Structures are given as C-alpha cells and as structure tokens.
Design a protein around this ligand. Structure first.
Ligand SMILES: Cc1cc(N)c(N)cc1Cl
Length: 150
C-alpha cells in the first residue's frame, strides 16, 4: 500500500507531479492530489507565467481544462518539437501526470526540495515524495476522495 510522487521545482508556484513512475492519474485524482499539496490545478495563464520563468517538462499533465506540456527548448521527442504551452488535442486515453499550483510558493524559480505533504488526510497508504535530487519525505495517509480512483 504505497504511492510514490515524483515532484519538480516550482516556477511561479507551478510544479509537475508524476505518480508511481508512469502516466497514472485521472482528472479527479489530479485535483485531489494537488489539494494534498495545498495546491490547485493551474489555470492556463498560471502555466504560461511558469513557462516564462523557466518551467518545462517532457510529460503530459492536467491543468484546469486541458492536458499540456510546457516547452521552452524544441525537442523532437517532447510535444513534437513545439515550444510554448503545448496542448494535447487528440488522445484515446484518460490518465496523465498532473501539474499543481501553490500560491504560497516563491514568484520565480524555486528548486528547493519538497519536504511535506501538508494537506493529506488520515489513511493507510505510505505516500513518498521523491525529489529530483533523490531526497524523500514519507508519511502515512490518503488524498483520493473518489472511489473510482481507489
Ligand atoms: C507543498 C509544498 C511543500 C514544500 N515543502 C515545498 N518546498 C513546496 C511545496 Cl509546493
């Protein structure tokens, strides 16, 4: 009974979360997961500002309304070489990573590690936050509020 959450630096409060090392988050789980970080799904405008401060990934994730990949540098294997906030148009499937937005984060790039999951609820799952530098924070809890996600 374990969930691992790989997290990134924050850029203007926006960060990326990947669950269990693969695309595995539904839209409802995404919202609940951001909730556990005292965060929300970013708006498009919040994502564009994060982009402008240096945020890019090579992974699809939810924002409010769409599934996107922020890209600064063109790369042929990330969002088909596009730059900007690339919006997924056509897909059969429903599970992605997520982006989250924490209003209390610093305004520009914050590449310190995440050391807490402040708004998790009581529960039986060992949840481990894994930072890009390998540092880890664990706690027992739950964040999913929808039966179909559990
Ligand atoms: C929820 C949260 C916790 C910590 N420690 C940091 N550093 C960043 C975020 Cl977004």
């Amino acid at each position: 009974n374990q969930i691992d959450l790989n997290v990134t630096c924050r850029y203007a409060g926006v960060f990326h979360v990947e669950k269990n090392g693969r695309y595995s988050i539904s839209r409802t789980e995404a919202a609940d997961l951001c909730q556990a970080f005292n965060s929300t799904l970013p708006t498009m405008d919040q994502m564009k500002l994060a982009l402008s401060k240096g945020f890019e990934t090579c992974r699809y994730g939810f924002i409010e309304g769409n599934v996107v990949i922020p890209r600064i540098h063109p790369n042929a294997i990330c969002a088909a070489n596009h730059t900007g906030v690339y919006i997924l148009v056509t897909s059969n499937t429903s599970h992605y990573d997520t982006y989250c937005f924490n209003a209390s984060a610093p305004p520009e790039e914050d590449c310190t590690s995440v050391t807490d999951l402040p708004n998790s609820f009581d529960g039986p799952v060992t949840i481990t936050i894994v930072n890009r530098d390998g540092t880890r924070y664990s706690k027992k809890g739950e964040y999913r509020t929808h039966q179909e996600d559990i």
